[PDB]
Design a protein around this ligand. Structure first.
Ligand SMILES: CCCCCCCCCCCCCCCCCC(=O)OC[C@H](COP(=O)([O-])OCC[N+](C)(C)C)OC(=O)CCCCCCCCCCCCCCCCC
Ligand SMILES: CCCCCCCCCCCCCCCCCC(=O)OC[C@H](COP(=O)([O-])OCC[N+](C)(C)C)OC(=O)CCCCCCCCCCCCCCCCC
Ligand SMILES: CCCCCCCCCCCCCCCCCC(=O)OC[C@H](COP(=O)(O)OCCN)OC(=O)CCCCCCCCCCCCCCCCC
Ligand SMILES: CCCCCCCCCCCCCCCCCC(=O)OC[C@H](COP(=O)(O)OCCN)OC(=O)CCCCCCCCCCCCCCCCC
Ligand SMILES: NC(=O)C1=CN([C@@H]2O[C@H](COP(=O)(O)OP(=O)(O)OC[C@H]3O[C@@H](n4cnc5c(N)ncnc54)[C@H](OP(=O)(O)O)[C@@H]3O)[C@@H](O)[C@H]2O)C=CC1
Ligand SMILES: CCCCCCCCCCCC(=O)OC[C@H](COP(=O)(O)OCC[N+](C)(C)C)OC(=O)CCCCCCCCCCC
Ligand SMILES: CCCCCCCCCCCC(=O)OC[C@H](COP(=O)(O)OCC[N+](C)(C)C)OC(=O)CCCCCCCCCCC
Ligand code: SF4
Ligand code: SF4
Ligand code: SF4
Ligand SMILES: [Zn+2]
Lengths: 48, 334, 156, 207, 46, 176, 56, 96, 154, 116
């Protein structure tokens, strides 16, 4: 890299991170999509 | 998954049961059976642990990916308990110990810690709370183990009124300290007993029955703010019971009496070690205490659990102690 | 000094010994066993870390599940695990042992060896290169180095 | 020539056609159909009663000497009443040729074991039994070869689910591996890939 | 507008590659191995 | 053409029979084996000093999957699902919708790295070089759940490994 | 290749063969790891006329 | 452009965030929620609009064979910019 | 899938020069070693007629003296344009099968020597985009190519 | 005709029923040996009950050929048990000890899920 440096991009990490498995900053999977079905919210005041 | 959590699926490993449980003391004898049943139906189980993560490994296979979650906690740190119950809808306390340690005595494991969990659970918004007590719990006995249980049971019933107290007898199973306790008296001589096992009546209960009872208390609505007494189907004399254990284990049975004070001293000798004591003064008292008969408390039959007779599932426990057995004489109901 | 300090050095000594003599029992079930053999080959020479090529199950400290675990083989693998003297660790090698991999949806494949035995390190790949497996063994050694068996005992 | 197209071999198509008639004439009692594919592979379709007669002739006859059983398998076509198609692939080292013999059966009708002709069929027939449920009569030792002990069903049948009906798992309460109904965290995604436009007009079936 | 460049052998091809078995013949004959062996015994006996 | 491997007749002249007698009694051929392993003792070993030395790889090496961007920061993936349709192990799960500005982008892009067979078909099928297999091969984890990547993990890998992915693609894009 | 002449003779004699001609370790006779860019050829069907697909 | 929910959890670029009463937040206790910080929708807005002198411009994403399939964008409508369907770059026609 | 990268064939040549010497070292440990011959000679003998009827193939036949090799009797690809020999056993035992395998490695090096010299130019996949996907360069410029790339991968 | 078909072993129900009993006697006499070799935690009587139940579920069969297959498969199962090809896990898969009972009443199904 001192002879052929990498191309610079503004989204590339400036700080390389080693394997974080087993540490408090590990990766935890989850769904990245929002809720599909919207349920009905009953009225907050009585009818009678 | 908006109001509580909606069950989904067939009730198998990859289903969703809607139960989000925090099981304190899940790394012990009764804990591994409670986690197995919760995780076997598709529940989100949170397992606080004080031990090495290596000692929690037998719990990882018990649930689908992401269903068993492990946290560090300290019995004397209220914040850690808060992090482990804030997201749960049911909290199960199985914290206990058969002996006192330099850092934890019976007033910590059975009174202060259970009350700490109950308080944090109440203000965290948890709706259901299951606490394990002892059948012979009352402040009148020579066992400091049983005196602590009575105090803790009252404090749990006060901090969390809607709690569900379970009062089981001596639980037997593969990893129990009851049938395996009456099988390790062979390297010293016969079988010491207060009196000769007479005037001591025991009503042991199967581990799966206790486990299945705790599960049904989570699902059952009419179990909030109630006390249960999980007991076996049959009653035995400690002499007859221990005789049966040795017969099933094919060990020579040579019972001889020993004075009550004499048994205390050998209990002192075996509690000087730094490891799990083989026996102690309190252990001898509890084994020789007579299992109370509380017919005013609903038991296993009130949760849809048929108590398992000790004769049916005693061979699976004592098989490993061996190097057509007559059932033990039982006390009639009368 | 404090009791924690004294019992923390003994923890280091036993942790050092156990990770410097990791003897593996390799369940070579499928192609991932070839890459396991390449980690013993001269280029990587796993024996230079103290990791003997192949120990008997009763002398073994770590089990490497390297390949597809089928239903027919599942009870056999559990029996070998139950007979391993402690402390015992399991390394899941490859996609088949990780989560079933290419045969995840088969009628005769266990969907991950972590339904039968507990797993300490998962090594991804199909197969992981011999260097990737070695990186996973050196991660298990780092995991043994972080154990606190005596601290937990002391603070009990 | 045409660089991207497979060249024909009309000499080998002629020879295999002649040998097919030869076999059809010598065994009219069983042979039901003979065909040669566009890539020069001879198929003899026979009645299942002719399995031993037809195979023995091809193995022993001086002009056949099909002394190797390359493979023996089954194909499940549910739309036929005889849903299974038993296929024999034979090799002749003397004449450097291959022949395929096909027959059929259903879930209940036995097939005759060709172990007396080719010893290699011992395990091939067990695999057919294990994976398709076709019973071979007079087999010296017929039993499952590939499936788990006590496995219910025959997986290679077209109506058997891909992921089966049971999955294994270790239960700590009973301290053993147990079988339970299959539940997949992610269901297999069934793709419908067929194009609605005919690809090969040469194979169009009559309306 | 350059030329096609793909992986090809050098002009003139590669050099010859040995494949035939090569186990060289070593040592003395059977007669001379027993002569040295017997002679060693005789000197030792003396 | 063919050759016989073991079809030679041993000579029966007295010299040859004595040459074979010397071999049997004096263990001559067992002593060549000792010479061949003494040779290897004085050859330099082929072992490398991992992890300070690494085994050589090539720009085509197939490692950890990762999601890339254009030079402007915009994601390359336009939620076409060709990678999902070709994955032999059915390890990719994609969901998509119109982004806030009308663009065609994924709301879900998961890869089950325990189903993946690390075959590279996805990066073959992608028309915009979005999903690639980077050069990383050291991402072993301690739990099964860390290998179920979602869109954030894959985008993080792309930002983390773009400097090296871009140079590997530049070295090999003319062969593909 | 860094072995001295003496150890070279010993390894050669014990094996019976000249090992230094064919070493199992790769020194600087292998291809450079950065190669010039290629320019691959096109197939027989890359034509602008007389290339109808029904004929091939 | 990572926004934080009232409880404190980061909102991902897909808009995902767990509600206040969702038990699934327990997976992040003792761990972290991995959220990519570079929102694509925000970075492609920063790119300047390109002024071209023709009705139809072609975009291939930049880089030739390393970009995306080459598409032609019509710029006759003066009330909006012509956006590339693959990469989001915008174009406008000079004074018409 | 792809074409050979520049510099590979020179690296295959360098590996192939030395590989016969590696086989000769293997033979210095096994072929004449009496202990190895005791474990393999006259062990597991298969008659040529049993081998054919039991469905054997490969050196399980050539070890018993059967002269059969699909690379020469039913050649595929360009095996009819290379020159090599088929090793044949005489006793049908483990030792003869071990010598067939070791001799097949020597013949494989012989074939590799001819592939390296006779490697021709051209493309590496059939120039029919309804079977083999087009190059990425033309998948990103031509409408037909993108259609055929799209449908060959879905 | 259409109804003419090859027999597997038995030409009518009477001959097939003979093979069923011969199989039942072989199974009935191996439960004590099976419960001993595999060190099962079940009793001999409930082991023989399971044998009876398996013979009872498919007791409505009237096709002689289907009966032959059920006996062919039954003998294969017996051979695996006698030879100890099976293990403790395979013998106990007849008892479904780990899956909770699925209620069979309409109301109980209605509360848990959408299945009939
Ligand atoms: C060179 C000569 C080689 C031969 C000599 C070898 C000497 C090696 C040093 C021995 C040091 C003692 C280590 C003993 C093992 C410790 C251990 O495994 O911890 C787990 C154990 C278990 O801890 P635990 O009690 O928390 O475990 C509970 C969890 N379950 C229920 C699952 C077990 O810790 C101990 O019990 C510590 C033992 C007491 C402290 C020992 C110090 C003795 C030092 C002098 C000897
Ligand atoms: C530091 C290390 C310093 C070197 C230490 C000595 C290493 C010697 C290892 C042997 C290396 C050479 C072996 C060799 O080439 O053998 C080929 C030769 C030839 O073996 P051959 O099998 O190829 O053929 C010989 C017979 N003809 C030619 C007729 C077929 O082997 C010998 O000469 C061995 C001599 C016999 C010695 C053993 C008997 C005496 C043992 C008891 C006394 C001690
Ligand atoms: C174990 C230690 C023994 C080491 C044996 C060394 C054998 C040896 O010297 O081999 C190498 C050498 C090769 O020479 P050569 O075969 O002539 O090469 C050109 C042929 N055209 O071979 C020779 O030139 C032969 C020289 C060595 C002769 C060894 C003596 C004969 C073997 C029988 C001796 C048995 C009695 C041993 C007495 C032991 C007393 C200590
Ligand atoms: C010994 C030297 C010797 O025999 O000279 C060679 C001579 C010529 O024989 P040749 O032409 O080589 O072929 C065999 C023909 N009979 O050989 C002869 O013609 C002599 C006759 C050959 C047969 C001799 C058989 C004697 C073998 C007995 C064992 C000798 C070793 C005994 C000592 C063992 C301990 C080392
Ligand atoms: N088993 C029986 O026979 C009987 C059980 N009970 C009661 O049920 C409860 C659990 O029973 P059981 O599982 O058999 O007992 P165990 O000894 O097998 O397990 C006790 C659990 O509590 C944990 N524990 C003990 N002290 C502490 C502490 N200071 N801080 C945190 N955790 C602690 C232990 O964690 P760790 O392992 O890491 O130390 C362990 O997980 C007890 O309260 C007991 O009184 C009631 C009647 C009979
Ligand atoms: C008095 C009680 C007896 C035990 C004495 C201590 C021995 C154990 C420590 C070595 C292992 C270790 O510590 O590992 C290697 C260490 C570095 O470890 P680190 O990465 O800094 O540790 C990080 C923290 N951990 C370990 C908790 C994760 O290397 C050293 O510099 C040690 C070299 C000097 C050792 C001298 C031993 C002399 C004692 C001989 C008689 C017992
Ligand atoms: C330790 C004290 C006692 C030593 C006794 C020595 C042996 C005495 C008897 C003579 C035998 C002898 O020398 O004959 C044997 C040979 C004569 O060589 P050649 O004619 O080429 O035989 C070989 C025939 N080929 C050429 C066909 C292979 O020996 C030598 O070349 C000496 C070798 C080194 C020995 C150490
Ligand atoms: S993970 Fe890949 S290499 Fe390993 S056994 Fe499975 S298919 Fe083979
Ligand atoms: S590399 Fe292969 S298995 Fe992995 S995601 Fe891509 S297509 Fe699927
Ligand atoms: S990664 Fe590529 S192939 Fe996959 S959906 Fe995105 S653009 Fe399509
Ligand atoms: Zn663009």
């Amino acid at each position: 890299p001192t002879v052929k440096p990498p191309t610079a991009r503004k989204f590339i990490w400036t700080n390389h991170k080693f394997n974080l498995s087993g540490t408090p900053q590990q990766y935890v999977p989850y769904s990245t999509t929002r809720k599909k079905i919207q349920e009905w919210v009953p009225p907050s005041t009585p009818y009678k | 998954l908006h109001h509580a959590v909606i069950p989904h699926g067939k009730g198998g490993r990859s289903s969703v049961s809607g139960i989000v449980a925090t099981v304190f003391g899940a790394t012990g004898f009764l804990g591994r059976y409670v986690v197995n049943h919760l995780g076997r139906m598709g529940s989100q189980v949170i397992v606080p642990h004080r031990c090495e993560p290596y000692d929690t490994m037998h719990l990882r296979p018990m649930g689908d990916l992401g269903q068993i979650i492990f946290m560090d906690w300290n019995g004397r740190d209220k914040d850690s308990i808060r992090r482990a119950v804030e997201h749960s809808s049911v909290v199960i306390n199985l914290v206990g110990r058969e002996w006192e340690t330099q850092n934890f005595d019976f007033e910590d494991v059975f009174v202060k810690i259970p009350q700490a969990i109950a308080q944090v659970s109440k203000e965290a918004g948890v709706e259901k709370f299951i606490h394990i007590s002892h059948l012979n719990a009352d402040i009148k006995s020579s066992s400091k183990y049983l005196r602590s249980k009575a105090v803790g049971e009252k404090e749990v019933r006060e901090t969390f009124p809607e709690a569900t107290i379970i009062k089981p007898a001596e639980i037997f199973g593969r990893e129990d300290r009851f049938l395996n306790y009456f099988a390790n008296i062979r390297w010293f001589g016969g079988v010491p007993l207060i009196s000769l096992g007479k005037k001591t009546v025991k009503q042991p209960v199967y581990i799966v029955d206790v486990t299945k009872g705790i599960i049904n208390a989570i699902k059952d609505p009419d179990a909030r703010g109630k006390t249960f007494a999980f007991v076996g189907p049959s009653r035995y004399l400690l002499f007859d019971l221990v005789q049966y254990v040795f017969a099933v284990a094919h060990r020579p049975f040579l019972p001889y009496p020993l004075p009550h004070f004499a048994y205390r001293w050998i209990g002192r000798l075996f509690e000087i070690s730094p490891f799990e004591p083989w026996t102690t003064r309190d252990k001898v008292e509890r084994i020789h205490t007579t299992d109370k008969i509380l017919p005013h408390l609903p038991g296993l039959e009130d949760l849809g659990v048929e108590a398992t007779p000790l004769e049916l599932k005693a061979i699976e426990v004592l098989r490993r102690h061996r190097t057509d057995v007559q059932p033990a004489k039982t006390i009639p109901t009368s | 000094s404090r009791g924690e300090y004294v019992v923390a050095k003994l923890d280091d000594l036993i942790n050092w010994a156990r990770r410097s003599s990791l003897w593996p029992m390799t369940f070579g079930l499928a192609c991932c066993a070839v890459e396991m053999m390449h980690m013993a080959a001269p280029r990587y020479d796993m024996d230079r870390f103290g990791v003997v090529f192949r120990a008997s199950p009763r002398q073994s400290d770590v089990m490497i599940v390297a390949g597809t675990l089928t239903n027919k083989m599942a009870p056999a693998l559990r029996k070998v695990y139950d007979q391993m003297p402690e402390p015992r660790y399991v390394v899941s090698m490859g996609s088949c042992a990780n989560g079933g991999g290419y045969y995840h949806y088969s009628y005769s494949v266990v969907r991950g060896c972590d339904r039968i035995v507990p797993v300490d390190i998962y090594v991804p790949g199909c197969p992981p290169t011999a260097e990737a497996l070695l990186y996973g063994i050196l991660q298990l050694q780092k995991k043994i180095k972080r154990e606190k068996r005596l601290r937990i005992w002391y603070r009990r | 020539t045409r660089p991207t197209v497979r060249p024909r071999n009309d000499v080998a198509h002629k020879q295999l056609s002649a040998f097919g008639e030869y076999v059809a004439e010598i065994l009219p009692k069983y042979v039901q159909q003979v065909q040669v594919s566009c890539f020069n592979e001879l198929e003899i379709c026979i009645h299942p009663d002719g399995v031993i007669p037809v195979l023995t002739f091809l193995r022993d006859h001086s002009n056949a000497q099909f002394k190797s059983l390359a493979d023996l398998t089954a194909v499940d076509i549910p739309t036929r009443q005889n849903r299974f198609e038993i296929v024999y692939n034979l090799l002749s080292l003397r004449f450097n040729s291959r022949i395929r013999v096909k027959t059929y059966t259903d879930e209940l009708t036995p097939i005759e074991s060709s172990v007396p002709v080719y010893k290699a069929a011992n395990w091939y027939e067990r695999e057919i039994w294990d994976m398709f449920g076709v019973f071979f009569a007079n087999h010296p030792d017929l039993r499952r070869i590939l499936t788990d002990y006590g496995f219910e069903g025959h997986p290679f049948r077209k109506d058997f689910p891909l992921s089966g009906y049971v999955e294994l798992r270790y239960d700590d309460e009973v301290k053993r591996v147990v079988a339970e109904p299959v539940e997949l965290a992610q269901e297999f995604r069934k793709f419908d890939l067929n194009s609605p436009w005919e690809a090969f007009p040469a194979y169009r079936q009559p309306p | 507008a350059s030329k096609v460049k793909q992986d090809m052998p050098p002009v003139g091809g590669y050099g010859p590659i040995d494949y035939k078995r090569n186990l060289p013949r070593r040592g003395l004959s059977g007669y001379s191995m027993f002569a040295v062996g017997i002679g060693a015994l005789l000197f030792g006996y003396w | 053409t063919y050759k016989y491997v073991n079809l030679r007749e041993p000579s029966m002249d007295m010299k040859s029979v004595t040459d074979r007698a010397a071999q049997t009694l004096l263990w001559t051929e067992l002593i060549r084996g000792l010479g061949m392993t003494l040779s290897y003792l004085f050859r330099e070993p082929a072992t490398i000093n991992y992890p300070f030395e690494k085994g050589p790889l090539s720009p085509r090496f197939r490692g950890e999957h990762a999601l890339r961007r254009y030079p402007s920061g915009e994601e390359r993936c336009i939620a076409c699902k060709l990678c999902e349709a070709v994955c032999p192990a059915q390890a990719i799960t994609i969901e998509a919708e119109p982004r806030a500005d009308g663009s065609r982008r994924t709301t879900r892009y998961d890869i089950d790295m325990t189903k993946c067979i690390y075959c590279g078909f996805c990066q073959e099928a992608c028309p915009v070089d979005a999903i690639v297999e980077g050069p990383n091969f050291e991402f072993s984890t301690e739990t099964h759940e860390e290998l179920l990547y979602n869109k954030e993990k894959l985008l993080n890998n792309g930002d983390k490994w773009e400097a090296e992915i871009a140079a590997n693609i530049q070295a090999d894009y003319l062969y593909r | 290749a860094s072995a001295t002449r003496f150890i070279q003779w010993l390894r050669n004699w014990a094996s019976g063969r000249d090992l230094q001609a064919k070493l199992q370790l790769r020194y600087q006779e292998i291809s450079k790891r950065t190669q010039p860019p290629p320019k691959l050829p096109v197939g027989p069907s890359h034509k602008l006329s007389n290339n109808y697909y029904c004929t091939r | 452009g990572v926004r934080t929910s009232p409880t404190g959890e980061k909102v991902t670029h897909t808009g995902q965030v767990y509600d206040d009463g969702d038990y699934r937040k327990v997976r992040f206790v003792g761990r972290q929620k991995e959220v990519n910080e570079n929102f694509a929708i925000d970075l492609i807005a920063e790119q300047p609009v390109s002024q071209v002198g023709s009705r139809v411009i072609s975009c291939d994403g930049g880089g030739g064979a390393l970009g995306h399939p080459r598409v032609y964008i019509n710029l006759d409508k003066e009330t909006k910019t012509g956006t590339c369907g693959y990469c989001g770059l915008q174009f406008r026609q000079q004074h018409h | 899938h792809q074409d050979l990268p520049l510099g590979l064939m020179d690296d295959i040549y360098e590996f192939s020069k030395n590989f016969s010497l590696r086989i000769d070292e293997l033979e210095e440990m096994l072929t004449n070693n009496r202990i190895w011959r005791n474990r393999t000679v006259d062990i597991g003998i298969v008659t040529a007629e049993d081998a054919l009827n039991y469905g054997f193939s490969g050196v399980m036949l050539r070890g018993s003296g059967i002269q059969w090799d699909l690379r020469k009797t039913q050649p595929y690809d360009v095996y009819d344009q290379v020159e090599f020999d088929v090793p044949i056993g005489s006793r049908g035992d483990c030792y003869d099968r071990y010598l067939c395998r070791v001799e097949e490695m020597r013949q494989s090096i012989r074939i590799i020597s001819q592939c390296l010299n006779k490697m021709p130019p051209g493309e590496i996949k059939v120039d029919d985009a309804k079977v083999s996907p087009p190059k990425r360069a033309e998948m990103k410029t031509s409408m037909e190519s993108l259609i055929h790339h799209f449908k060959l991968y879905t | 005709a259409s109804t003419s078909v090859k027999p597997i072993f038995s030409r009518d129900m009477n001959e097939a029923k003979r093979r069923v009993r011969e199989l039942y006697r072989a199974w009935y006499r191996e439960v004590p040996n099976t419960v001993h070799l595999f060190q099962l935690d079940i009793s001999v009587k409930q082991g023989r009950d399971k044998v009876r139940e398996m013979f009872k579920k498919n007791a409505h069969i009237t096709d002689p050929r289907v009966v032959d297959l059920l006996v062919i498969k039954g003998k294969m199962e017996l051979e695996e048990t006698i030879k100890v090809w099976k293990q403790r896990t395979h013998v106990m898969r007849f008892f479904h000890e780990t899956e909770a009972p699925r209620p069979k009443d309409f109301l109980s199904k209605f509360y848990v899920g959408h299945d009939p």
